[PDB]
Design an enzyme around this catalytic site. Structure first.
Site, mmCIF file in Angstrom:
data_model
loop_
_atom_site.group_PDB
_atom_site.id
_atom_site.type_symbol
_atom_site.label_atom_id
_atom_site.label_comp_id
_atom_site.label_asym_id
_atom_site.label_seq_id
_atom_site.Cartn_x
_atom_site.Cartn_y
_atom_site.Cartn_z
ATOM 1 N N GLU A 61 7.170 41.302 24.464
ATOM 2 C CA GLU A 61 5.726 41.362 24.629
ATOM 3 C C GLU A 61 5.421 40.790 26.014
ATOM 4 O O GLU A 61 4.715 41.396 26.817
ATOM 5 C CB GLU A 61 5.037 40.559 23.530
ATOM 6 C CG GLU A 61 5.412 41.005 22.144
ATOM 7 C CD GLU A 61 4.320 40.759 21.143
ATOM 8 O OE1 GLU A 61 4.157 39.616 20.696
ATOM 9 O OE2 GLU A 61 3.629 41.723 20.789
ATOM 10 N N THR A 96 -0.323 37.775 19.099
ATOM 11 C CA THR A 96 -0.253 39.080 19.719
ATOM 12 C C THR A 96 -0.568 40.194 18.717
ATOM 13 O O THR A 96 -0.578 41.382 19.068
ATOM 14 C CB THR A 96 1.118 39.293 20.325
ATOM 15 O OG1 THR A 96 2.106 39.160 19.302
ATOM 16 C CG2 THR A 96 1.384 38.250 21.395
ATOM 17 N N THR A 97 -0.818 39.808 17.466
ATOM 18 C CA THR A 97 -1.147 40.761 16.411
ATOM 19 C C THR A 97 -2.484 40.368 15.799
ATOM 20 O O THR A 97 -2.919 39.220 15.932
ATOM 21 C CB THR A 97 -0.101 40.725 15.268
ATOM 22 O OG1 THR A 97 -0.037 39.398 14.727
ATOM 23 C CG2 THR A 97 1.284 41.139 15.762
ATOM 24 N N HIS A 110 4.942 45.129 9.604
ATOM 25 C CA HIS A 110 4.809 44.986 11.056
ATOM 26 C C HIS A 110 6.135 44.518 11.647
ATOM 27 O O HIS A 110 6.430 44.758 12.827
ATOM 28 C CB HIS A 110 3.717 43.968 11.405
ATOM 29 C CG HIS A 110 2.530 44.050 10.483
ATOM 30 N ND1 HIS A 110 1.915 45.224 10.328
ATOM 31 C CD2 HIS A 110 1.964 43.176 9.520
ATOM 32 C CE1 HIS A 110 0.993 45.162 9.317
ATOM 33 N NE2 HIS A 110 1.024 43.896 8.817
ATOM 34 N N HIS A 126 10.038 41.242 17.978
ATOM 35 C CA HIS A 126 9.266 42.370 18.459
ATOM 36 C C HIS A 126 10.320 43.113 19.253
ATOM 37 O O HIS A 126 10.942 42.524 20.143
ATOM 38 C CB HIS A 126 8.150 41.892 19.380
ATOM 39 C CG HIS A 126 7.095 41.112 18.645
ATOM 40 N ND1 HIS A 126 6.054 41.777 18.142
ATOM 41 C CD2 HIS A 126 6.863 39.745 18.367
ATOM 42 C CE1 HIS A 126 5.166 40.917 17.563
ATOM 43 N NE2 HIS A 126 5.666 39.660 17.703
ATOM 44 N N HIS A 141 10.001 35.082 18.203
ATOM 45 C CA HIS A 141 8.913 34.122 18.155
ATOM 46 C C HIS A 141 9.109 33.168 16.998
ATOM 47 O O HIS A 141 9.219 33.589 15.844
ATOM 48 C CB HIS A 141 7.563 34.804 17.989
ATOM 49 C CG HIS A 141 7.188 35.633 19.169
ATOM 50 N ND1 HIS A 141 6.136 36.436 19.050
ATOM 51 C CD2 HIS A 141 7.702 35.851 20.460
ATOM 52 C CE1 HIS A 141 5.947 37.156 20.191
ATOM 53 N NE2 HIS A 141 6.914 36.799 21.060
ATOM 54 N N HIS A 185 9.893 35.696 13.808
ATOM 55 C CA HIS A 185 9.976 37.153 13.762
ATOM 56 C C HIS A 185 10.369 37.704 15.115
ATOM 57 O O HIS A 185 10.498 36.964 16.086
ATOM 58 C CB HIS A 185 8.644 37.782 13.304
ATOM 59 C CG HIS A 185 7.466 37.402 14.197
ATOM 60 N ND1 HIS A 185 6.783 36.290 13.911
ATOM 61 C CD2 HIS A 185 6.947 37.873 15.425
ATOM 62 C CE1 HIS A 185 5.873 36.014 14.883
ATOM 63 N NE2 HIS A 185 5.970 36.990 15.821
HETATM 64 C C1 LIG Z 1 0.389 39.162 11.694
HETATM 65 N N1 LIG Z 1 -0.011 37.836 12.161
HETATM 66 C C2 LIG Z 1 1.387 37.416 12.150
HETATM 67 C C3 LIG Z 1 1.670 36.497 10.952
HETATM 68 N N2 LIG Z 1 0.746 35.375 11.106
HETATM 69 C C4 LIG Z 1 -0.358 35.182 10.360
HETATM 70 C C5 LIG Z 1 -0.189 35.161 8.970
HETATM 71 C C6 LIG Z 1 -1.260 34.898 8.120
HETATM 72 C C7 LIG Z 1 -2.519 34.647 8.640
HETATM 73 C C8 LIG Z 1 -2.709 34.664 10.019
HETATM 74 O O1 LIG Z 1 -3.847 34.379 10.582
HETATM 75 C C9 LIG Z 1 -4.978 34.004 9.784
HETATM 76 C C10 LIG Z 1 -1.643 34.940 10.889
HETATM 77 S S1 LIG Z 1 1.271 34.394 12.111
HETATM 78 O O2 LIG Z 1 0.250 33.419 12.585
HETATM 79 O O3 LIG Z 1 2.490 33.723 11.565
HETATM 80 C C11 LIG Z 1 1.686 35.340 13.472
HETATM 81 S S2 LIG Z 1 2.039 34.592 14.950
HETATM 82 C C12 LIG Z 1 2.337 36.140 15.628
HETATM 83 S S3 LIG Z 1 2.826 36.293 17.283
HETATM 84 N N3 LIG Z 1 3.457 37.591 17.608
HETATM 85 O O4 LIG Z 1 1.674 36.058 18.072
HETATM 86 O O5 LIG Z 1 3.794 35.291 17.333
HETATM 87 C C13 LIG Z 1 2.153 37.162 14.715
HETATM 88 C C14 LIG Z 1 1.773 36.737 13.461
HETATM 89 ZN ZN LIG Z 2 5.349 37.716 17.552
#
Ligand SMILES: CN[C@@H]1CN(c2cccc(OC)c2)S(=O)(=O)c2sc(S(N)(=O)=O)cc21
Ligand SMILES: [Zn+2]
Ligand SMILES: [Hg+2]
EC number: 4.2.1.1
Length: 257
Positions: A103, A195-196, A61, A93, A116, A91
């Site tokens: 975003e 956001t994911t 992603h 976007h 982020h 990370h």
């Molecule tokens: C894909 N999800 C990302 C990775 N994460 C993740 C990893 C493991 C478990 C989980 O939830 C149970 C979440 S995360 O919480 O570090 C985030 S925060 C985020 S954003 N764009 O909103 O900042 C994207 C992702």
């Molecule tokens: Zn993000």
């Protein structure tokens, strides 16, 4: 699985994750004129001097830089937050063009990318537990505009060669995240979600007013990553962003006039 393509993009996420249509989803458009200035907002406290980066990886992603969040090394405090939040990863976007990628949008204006820095509330023990709470995470959103190069991002850029395809990772120690921060810490804040997928509503969004600028070739390297794994047909990682969600029954507070 979910992704950003026509057949598995954001407009399909609700089918596997109903919270996609929840009450406090991100990102949202930030209307500067209806955001309420809150004088009771404290300044942000970003303590990144003991930050220990460890690895960078392409997770299909986006590429993530992970930090040793075993102890309070890089914490975020103050602002709209009550409690200490530990830095775990950061990370980006970005888009296939310079006029999209962020975003969050300011007055409907999109930026080239959005950084982020993800933190989790320490009173919860671990990240896993934090994601089960309405105030479990705090994400520092920082916009990126195209202009002059950000020297602090270059170290990240060079290594992208090593993690081209999904699943690839490389050691990335001694990286100082302080080099990606703007001069000002003025911000906008509001309660939201990831956001994911899984799209959990556990986030206090702290979006900075001042964006950082990176060069055209710096963001260019971003667009050369692959969503796919080695061997599979190549699918360029671009436009890994989710469109703005309705604000609903929420208010954006500004820490500035
Ligand atoms: C894909 N999800 C990302 C990775 N994460 C993740 C990893 C493991 C478990 C989980 O939830 C149970 C979440 S995360 O919480 O570090 C985030 S925060 C985020 S954003 N764009 O909103 O900042 C994207 C992702
Ligand atoms: Zn993000
Ligand atoms: Hg939550």
């Amino acid at each position: 699985h979910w992704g950003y393509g026509k057949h598995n993009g954001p407009e399909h996420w609700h089918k596997d994750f109903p919270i996609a249509k929840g009450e406090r989803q991100s990102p949202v458009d930030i209307d500067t004129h209806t955001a309420k200035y809150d004088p009771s907002l404290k300044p942000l406290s970003v303590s990144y001097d003991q930050a220990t980066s460890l690895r960078i990886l392409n997770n299909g992603h986006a590429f993530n830089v992970e930090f040793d969040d075993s102890q309070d090394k890089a914490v975020l405090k103050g602002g709209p937050l009550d409690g200490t939040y530990r830095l775990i990863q950061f990370h980006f976007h970005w888009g296939s063009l310079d006029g999209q990628g962020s975003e969050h949008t300011v007055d409907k204006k999109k930026y080239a990318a959005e950084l982020h820095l993800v933190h989790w509330n320490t009173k919860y023990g671990d990240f896993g537990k934090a994601v089960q709470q309405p105030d479990g995470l705090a994400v520092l959103g920082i916009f990126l505009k195209v202009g002059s190069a950000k020297p602090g991002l270059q170290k990240v850029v060079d290594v992208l060669d090593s993690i081209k395809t999904k699943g690839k990772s490389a050691d990335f120690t001694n990286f100082d995240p302080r080099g990606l921060l703007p001069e000002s810490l003025d911000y906008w804040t509001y309660p939201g979600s990831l956001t994911t997928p899984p799209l959990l509503e556990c986030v206090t969004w702290i979006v900075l007013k001042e964006p950082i600028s990176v060069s055209s070739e710096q963001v260019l390297k971003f667009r050369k990553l692959n969503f796919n794994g080695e061997g599979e047909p190549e699918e360029l990682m671009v436009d890994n962003w989710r469109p703005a969600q309705p604000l609903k029954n929420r208010q954006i507070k500004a820490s500035f006039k």
